[PDB]
C-alpha cells in the first residue's frame, strides 16, 4: 500500500558478517549461523527469511544480543543458491537479497539424516 510506517530506521546501517552469510559458499547439511551487527539500524524489529534453492520457505532462528547486534542460525538441508531476505522494521537492507551458495559436504555428522 501507498501508506507506510516511515519510522526512524535505516537498514543501510545493518552489517552482515559470518559463516551463514559466506559468499564463497557454505557447507550444506550443516547448522550455520551468522551475525547482524547493527547499531543504528533503527528502533524496529529485525526479520530474516531463507528460501531453499527450490523455491520454498525454510526455518530460521533469530537471537537478540542487545549489544547493538544480532545472531541468526539455520540449517540448509538442501544445496544450491539460497535466497536470504533480511528486512528491518520494514526496510530491506541494501545487501539483500543475500545470494548464498551451499556446497555439498558429502558426509556430515551431527546434522540432517534421512533414512
UniProtKB/Swiss-Prot annotation:
* Cellular compartments annotated: Cytoplasm; Membrane; Cytoplasm, Cytoskeleton; Cytoplasm, Myofibril, Sarcomere, Z line
What is the recorded name of this protein? Filamin-C
Q: In which tissues is it expressed?
A: Highly expressed in striated muscles. Weakly expressed in thyroid, fetal brain, fetal lung, retina, spinal cord and bone marrow. Not expressed in testis, pancreas, adrenal gland, placenta, liver and kidney.
Q: What family does the database annotate?
A: Belongs to the filamin family.
Q: What else is known?
A: Silenced in MKN28 and MKN74 gastric cancer cell lines due to aberrant methylation of the gene.
User: How the protein assembles, per its UniProt entry?
Assistant: Homodimer; the filamin repeat 24 and the second hinge domain are important for dimer formation. Interacts with FLNB, INPPL1, ITGB1A, KCND2, MYOT, MYOZ1 and MYOZ3. Interacts with sarcoglycans SGCD and SGCG. Interacts (via filament repeats 17-18, 20-21 and 24) with USP25 (isoform USP25m only). Interacts with FBLIM1. Interacts with XIRP1; this interaction is mediated by filamin 20 repeat. Interacts with KY. Interacts with IGFN1. Interacts with MICALL2. Interacts with ANK3. Interacts with SYNPO2.
Q: What does the UniProt record say this protein does?
A: Muscle-specific filamin, which plays a central role in sarcomere assembly and organization. Critical for normal myogenesis, it probably functions as a large actin-cross-linking protein with structural functions at the Z lines in muscle cells. May be involved in reorganizing the actin cytoskeleton in response to signaling events.
Full-protein interval shown: 1536 to 1637 of 2725
**This protein's superkingdom?**
Eukaryota
What does the record give as the organism's lineage?
Eukaryota, Metazoa, Chordata, Craniata, Vertebrata
Q: How is it modified after translation?
A: Ubiquitinated by FBXL22, leading to proteasomal degradation.
Which disorder is it associated with?
Myopathy, myofibrillar, 5: A form of myofibrillar myopathy, a group of chronic neuromuscular disorders characterized at ultrastructural level by disintegration of the sarcomeric Z disk and myofibrils, and replacement of the normal myofibrillar markings by small dense granules, or larger hyaline masses, or amorphous material. MFM5 is characterized by onset in adulthood, clinical features of a limb-girdle myopathy, and focal myofibrillar destruction. Myopathy, distal, 4: A slowly progressive muscular disorder characterized by distal muscle weakness and atrophy affecting the upper and lower limbs. Onset occurs around the third to fourth decades of life, and patients remain ambulatory even after long disease duration. Muscle biopsy shows non-specific changes with no evidence of rods, necrosis, or inflammation.
State the Filamin repeat positions.
8-102
**What does the record say mutating residue 96 to L does?**
In RCM5; increased protein aggregates; effect on cytoplasm localization; localized in perinuclear region of cytoplasm; no effect on expression
Amino acid at each position: 500500500g501507498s501508506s507506510g510506517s516511515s519510522g526512524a530506521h535505516d537498514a543501510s546501517k545493518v552489517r552482515a558478517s559470518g559463516p551463514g552469510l559466506n559468499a564463497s559458499g557454505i557447507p550444506a547439511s550443516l547448522p550455520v549461523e551468522f551475525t547482524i551487527d547493527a547499531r543504528d539500524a533503527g528502533e524496529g524489529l529485525l526479520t530474516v527469511q531463507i528460501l531453499d534453492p527450490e523455491g520454498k520457505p525454510k526455518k530460521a532462528n533469530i537471537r537478540d544480543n542487545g549489544d547493538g547486534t544480532y545472531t541468526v542460525s539455520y540449517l540448509p538441508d538442501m544445496s544450491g543458491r539460497y535466497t536470504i531476505t533480511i528486512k528491518y522494521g520494514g526496510d530491506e537492507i541494501p545487501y539483500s537479497p543475500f545470494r548464498i551458495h551451499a556446497l555439498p559436504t558429502g558426509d556430515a555428522s551431527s546434522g540432517p539424516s534421512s533414512g
